[PDB]
Amino acid sequence: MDEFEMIKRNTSEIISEEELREVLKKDEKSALIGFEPSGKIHLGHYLQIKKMIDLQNAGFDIIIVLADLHAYLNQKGELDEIRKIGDYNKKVFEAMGLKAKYVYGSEWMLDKDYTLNVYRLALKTTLKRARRSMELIAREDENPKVAEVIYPIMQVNGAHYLGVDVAVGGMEQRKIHMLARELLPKKVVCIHNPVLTGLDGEGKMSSSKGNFIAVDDSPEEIRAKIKKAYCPAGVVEGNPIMEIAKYFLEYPLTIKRPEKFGGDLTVNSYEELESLFKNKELHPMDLKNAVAEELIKILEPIRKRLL
């Protein structure tokens, strides 16, 4: 539609936009996203869930894969310890306002029929394509393990096992999604979300990096992290404060600032906040204060539920 544009909104690419339109014409449609369990669920994760919500509202049946086996394979720790992290993740996503079927990797990824197809894919996959597909995913290892090349082929097969019409991931999943489109009999539509900039300006919002706003973060933590964050005046590109404002805030918005500092600015859209920021009219402190307070209101239900 419409459904199309709502879905295309705030994504980096759709492989392929055309095939997405075709899928939308169907009465029955399915979509998945998978996540390696992570102790902290941040704004990078929420952005993607909002995308699922968008697909959910467009008629898609949503599947969330808690990929405990992939994280095991990607050296995140012990299988039982990762499933418990995955139990917590389900609860967080179950607070984010999306009705979806939740599924653990370790349930069906050890199925005889599953395992059999993984081996069939291993025969079709070159070690070079499997190694290349993992560059932006693999935990830095000085001596690459056999688990590294099993990881993409198991991810590829999940889209097949589940029978999804669409696979959703961040931009770093692009190569595994490209592999999936070459190894599977049914080509799946691949929707890619942008990579959120970390709070310190360092590329990606990451759980192990400590430069993220977690969805369960208390108001004081949100204010503190927003305060220390990279946000020089006039810069929009790679500004994490500006990115949160783009992706998470509802517009029109009003920035409650001191009367002597310029009054009170009411912002019609993100792009209005953009031109005001780029043109020194809105100081970083004022932007920070408004962003912190709005974020506190948006994640208030998530936070509230998780206790």
Ligand X SMILES: N#Cc1ccc(C[C@H](N)C(=O)O)cc1
Neighbouring residues of 81: CB distance < 8 A, sequence distance ≥ 6: none
11 vs 289 by CB, closer to ligand X: 11
Q: Which two tokens stand for residue 129?
A: 């394509």
If one asks whether residue 46 binds ligand X (CB under 6 A), the answer comes out as no
User: How many chain residues touch ligand X (CB under 6 A)?
Assistant: 13
Span interacting with ligand X, options 154-162, 201-209, 248-256, 298-306, rule CB under 6 A:
154-162
Contact criterion met (CB below 8 Å) for 203 and 195: yes
Instruction: Say how far apart CA 291 and CA 222 lie, in whole Å.
Output: 9
If one asks whether residue 34 binds ligand X (CB under 6 A), the answer comes out as yes
If one asks whether residue 173 binds ligand X (CB under 6 A), the answer comes out as yes
- Residue from 159, 166, 189, 245 touching ligand X (CB under 6 A): that is 159
- Residue from 45, 51, 70, 223 touching ligand X (CB under 6 A): that is 70
Amino acid symbol at 141: D
Region of 85 on the Ramachandran plot (φ > 0 left; ψ -120 to 50 alpha; else beta):
alpha
Region of 37 on the Ramachandran plot (φ > 0 left; ψ -120 to 50 alpha; else beta):
beta
If one asks whether residue 37 binds ligand X (CB under 6 A), the answer comes out as no
If one asks whether residue 86 binds ligand X (CB under 6 A), the answer comes out as no
Instruction: Collapse the DSSP code of 166 into the 3-class scheme (helix H, G, I; strand E, B; otherwise coil) and give the result.
Output: strand
56 vs 207 by CB, closer to ligand X: 207
Segment 126 to 145, residues that bind ligand X, using CB under 6 A:
137
If one asks whether residue 158 binds ligand X (CB under 6 A), the answer comes out as yes
List, in sequence order, every residue forming a beta bridge with 168; answer none if it has no partner.
33, 191
Contact residues for ligand X (CB under 6 A)?
32, 34-36, 65, 67, 70, 137, 155, 158-159, 169, 173
